[PDB]
Write an enzyme that holds these catalytic residues in place. Structure first.
Site, mmCIF file in Angstrom:
data_model
loop_
_atom_site.group_PDB
_atom_site.id
_atom_site.type_symbol
_atom_site.label_atom_id
_atom_site.label_comp_id
_atom_site.label_asym_id
_atom_site.label_seq_id
_atom_site.Cartn_x
_atom_site.Cartn_y
_atom_site.Cartn_z
ATOM 1 C CB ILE A 18 -1.027 -0.009 1.154
ATOM 2 C CG1 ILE A 18 -0.393 0.163 2.543
ATOM 3 C CG2 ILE A 18 -1.891 -1.256 1.088
ATOM 4 C CD1 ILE A 18 -1.438 0.299 3.657
ATOM 5 C CB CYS A 19 1.222 4.186 -2.053
ATOM 6 S SG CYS A 19 2.098 5.772 -2.099
ATOM 7 C CG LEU A 20 0.746 3.760 4.250
ATOM 8 C CD1 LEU A 20 1.331 3.434 5.618
ATOM 9 C CD2 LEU A 20 -0.752 3.469 4.228
#
Length: 162
Positions: free
Chosen positions: A116-118
């Site tokens: 995931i890209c926070l």
């Protein structure tokens, strides 16, 4: 500060962690793992009480690989996703990268492999709080809000189905 109040409202009932130790740190890592599991289990307990029991995690023996499931409810349908991550050697100063492998390639805010890209605000929030935040905080502040944006978008586009 709105950001400081928003953080406190989410995490105030999660036990704070103490030990600066990663996977290679022997008796200090075993201590950090005690803090990790008590923080996680209190978070789960609080989740159950609030009818928001949304994930299970387990680790390998050494506590270096974590995996489980999260459940996201949308229009009363429950969606289940497998999750996993490795603890970085430089944990807990460095945050782990949560992978949702079955969504690999299907979300813009995601790296190759389903990591995931926070948001740009999660990392400096983690950094400011080192080493008080742990895996419970990663789930509450990282994955939780990513699901609350990305899962509804995937359902509306018809990319995933019940």
């Amino acid at each position: 500060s709105m950001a400081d109040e928003a953080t406190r409202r989410v995490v105030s009932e999660i036990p704070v962690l103490k030990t600066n130790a990663g996977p290679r740190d022997r008796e200090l890592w075993v201590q950090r793992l005690k803090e990790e599991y008590q923080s996680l289990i209190r978070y789960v307990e609080n989740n159950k009480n609030a009818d928001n029991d949304w994930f299970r995690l387990e680790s390998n023996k050494e506590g270096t690989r974590w995996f489980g499931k999260c459940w996201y409810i949308h229009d009363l349908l429950k969606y289940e996703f497998d999750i996993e991550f490795d603890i970085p050697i430089t944990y807990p100063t460095t945050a782990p990268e949560i992978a949702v492998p079955e969504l690999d390639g299907k979300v813009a805010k995601m790296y190759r492999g389903g990591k995931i890209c926070l948001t740009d605000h999660f990392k400096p929030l983690w950094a400011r709080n080192v080493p008080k935040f742990g895996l419970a905080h990663l789930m509450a502040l990282g994955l939780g809000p990513w699901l609350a944006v990305e899962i509804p978008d995937l359902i509306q586009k018809g990319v995933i189905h019940h």
